[PDB]
Design a protein around this ligand. Structure first.
Ligand SMILES: [N]S(=O)(=O)[C][C][C]C1234B567B89%10B5%11%12B85%13B98%14B%1061B821B326B%115(B%12724)C%13%1416
Ligand SMILES: [Zn+2]
Length: 257
C-alpha cells in the first residue's frame, strides 16, 4: 500500500496513481516574488460558528477530525471560490524535526507542519461526486511554526493518546476549528490536487500567509502517533508530507499587496 517510506512513499505513487505526474499536482513552492496580487480576489469568508465535529480518526497516514456535513453549517466561500463549500474534515502533515513537515513551501521555506481544512462544493451534492470535478474541493492550508502554544489546538493534542494506532477513532464532539485560525486571512491561491492518493486534480488551494504558532510539546505529541495498527511493529507517524511538485502551466495569485 502507498505511504511515506523509502519503498512506498511519494516517489512511488505514480505507479498506482499515474496522475501523480499530472499538470496540476499539489503541493507547490510559493515563490512570493512571482505570485501576483489579484485585486479581483475577494476576502475569504470562513463561517465555522455552527461547525459540529463528530470524531477523530487515525487512518494510518494522519489523524482526521471529522464534521457533520449533512447541512450547510461550517462553510467556506468568497476568496477565489464560486458558490459554497462545506467543511468535511481537517488533518495535518508534520515532520520528524521542526525544520520540515509542511507540504507547501514559501520561497523554499518548510514549516514544522501544515493544517488542511477540506471542503466540498455543495453544487455536486456529495464529496465522492465533488472529487471528480475540477472545482470540487477547496482546501484551506495553514502553516504551523514552533513557538508559543496554540490553546485552541490542545483539545486535539490531548485525545491523540486514545488513537495512537491505525484504525483507532474516538468521539470528538464540540471542537471549534475557529481556534486553529491565524489573525489574518491573507492568502495565496492556485488550482491543484489532493496531496495523497488518489491525487485527484479537484482542489482550489487557499494557503494562508500568516502561520499559527504551536508549542514544541504540542508537535511532539503529533510525533508519538503510529502509522502501524495496534500490535504491529512501531513506526512513528512522522514525515507524512508530499514534497513540492512542478508548477507547470499555473499562476499563484495573492489576495494581498
Ligand atoms: N492532503 S489533502 O489533499 O487534503 C488529502 C487528505 C487525504 C484524503 B484521502 B481522500 B481520503 B478522502 B480525500 B483524500 B482527502 B481525506 B479522505 B483522505 C479525503
Ligand atoms: Zn492534507
Amino acid at each position: 500500500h502507498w505511504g511515506y517510506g523509502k519503498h512506498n512513499g511519494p516517489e512511488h505513487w505514480h505507479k498506482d496513481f499515474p496522475i501523480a505526474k499530472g499538470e496540476r499536482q499539489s503541493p507547490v513552492d510559493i515563490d512570493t516574488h512571482t505570485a501576483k496580487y489579484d485585486p479581483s480576489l475577494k476576502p475569504l469568508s470562513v463561517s465555522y460558528d455552527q461547525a459540529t465535529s463528530l470524531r477523530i480518526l487515525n487512518n494510518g497516514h494522519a489523524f482526521n477530525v471529522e464534521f457533520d456535513d449533512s447541512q450547510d453549517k461550517a462553510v467556506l466561500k468568497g476568496g477565489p471560490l464560486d458558490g459554497t463549500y462545506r467543511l468535511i474534515q481537517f488533518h495535518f502533515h508534520w515532520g520528524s524535526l521542526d525544520g520540515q513537515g509542511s507540504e507547501h513551501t514559501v520561497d523554499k521555506k518548510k514549516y514544522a507542519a501544515e493544517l488542511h481544512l477540506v471542503h466540498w462544493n455543495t453544487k455536486y451534492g456529495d464529496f465522492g461526486k465533488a472529487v471528480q470535478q475540477p472545482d470540487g474541493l477547496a482546501v484551506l492550508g495553514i502553516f504551523l511554526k514552533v513557538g508559543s502554544a496554540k490553546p485552541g489546538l490542545q483539545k486535539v493534542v490531548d485525545v491523540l493518546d486514545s488513537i495512537k494506532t491505525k484504525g483507532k477513532s474516538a468521539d470528538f464532539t464540540n471542537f471549534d476549528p475557529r481556534g486553529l485560525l491565524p489573525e489574518s486571512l491573507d492568502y495565496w491561491t492556485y488550482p491543484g490536487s489532493l496531496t495523497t492518493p488518489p491525487l485527484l486534480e479537484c482542489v482550489t488551494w487557499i494557503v494562508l500567509k500568516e502561520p499559527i504558532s504551536v508549542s514544541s510539546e504540542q508537535v511532539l505529541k503529533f510525533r508519538k502517533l503510529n502509522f502501524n495498527g495496534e500490535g504491529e511493529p512501531e513506526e512513528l507517524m512522522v514525515d507524512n508530507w508530499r514534497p513540492a511538485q512542478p508548477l507547470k502551466n499555473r499562476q499563484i495569485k495573492a489576495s494581498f499587496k
